[PDB]
């Protein structure tokens, strides 16, 4: 039911702010290709912010600092960050996840869904890029978003996250 602009999914592109104009963008007008939409959906479970204290965040109240091991190789990247935990979880690429008991696991929190995304496609679409830069085919128009209120409790520690001693997520301190 709730429909927002697809430009708010990719946080770098300005959205329907409280302004008559934006940084030379306009919602429901500028196209966006499949690749950037799809790699912008990967930023939902891990980099979702507060939407005015009534719209919920991700598995953390604020997007935490992420510390992580880098390597020259993709095999080296995957191998150097292999530290597992005994819990399994339920990742979102399965169907509806089972709530069950608390401490849901690791693959469940890696693929947590704070917001439903459905998307919609009109009678074909565009003919060239207008916001991405890579000239693609008929692009998408807008996205659909809703809010899942994350239930209270849910004791969960992030493998890459940086956590305060009081349990709140640690945000970057740049103003």
The distance from CA 92 to its chain's CA centroid, rounded to whole angstroms, is: 13
The answer on whether 130 is annotated among ligand-binding residues is: no
Angle ∠(99,100,106) on CA atoms, nearest 5: 70
Nearer to DNA, 136 or 142 (CB): 142
The answer to whether residue 52 forms part of the interface with DNA (CB under 7 A) is: yes
Nearer to DNA, 21 or 53 (CB): 53
The answer to whether residue 132 forms part of the interface with Mg ion (CB under 5 A) is: yes
Q: Is 79 helix (H, G, I), strand (E, B) or coil?
A: helix
DSSP 1: -
The answer on whether 132 is annotated among ligand-binding residues is: yes
- What is the smallest separation between the CB atom of 20 and DNA, expressed in angstroms? 12
Distance CA 29, CA 16 (A): 12
The answer to whether residue 116 forms part of the interface with DNA (CB under 7 A) is: no
> Residues with Cβ < 8 Å from 119, sequence gap 6 or more?
6, 37, 140, 142, 143, 144
The answer to whether residue 55 forms part of the interface with DNA (CB under 7 A) is: yes
Nearer to Mg ion, 137 or 148 (CB): 137
Span near DNA by CB under 7 A; candidates 14-22, 69-77, 98-106, 113-121: 14-22
* Residue 171 near residue 63, CB atoms below 8 Å: yes
User: Contact positions toward Mg ion, by CB under 5 A?
Assistant: 33, 35-36, 132, 134
């Amino acid at each position: 039911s709730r429909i927002r602009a697809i430009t708010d999914l990719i946080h770098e592109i300005p959205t329907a702010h409280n302004l008559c104009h934006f940084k030379h963008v306009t919602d429901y007008i500028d196209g966006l290709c499949e690749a950037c939409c799809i790699k912008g959906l990967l930023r939902l479970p891990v980099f979702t912010t507060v939407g005015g204290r009534g719209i919920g965040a991700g598995i953390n109240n604020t997007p935490p600092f992420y510390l992580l091991w880098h390597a020259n190789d993709l095999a080296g990247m995957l191998a150097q960050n292999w530290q597992p935990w005994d819990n399994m979880g339920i990742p979102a690429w399965l169907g509806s996840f089972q709530k069950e008991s608390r401490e849901v696991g690791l693959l469940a929190g890696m693929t947590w869904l704070p917001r439903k995304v459905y998307l919609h496609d009109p009678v074909p679409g565009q003919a060239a890029c207008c916001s991405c830069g890579l000239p693609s085919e008929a692009l998408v128009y807008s996205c659909s978003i809703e809010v899942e209120p994350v239930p209270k409790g849910l004791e969960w520690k992030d493998p890459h996250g940086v956590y305060t001693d009081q349990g709140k997520s640690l945000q970057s301190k740049i103003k």
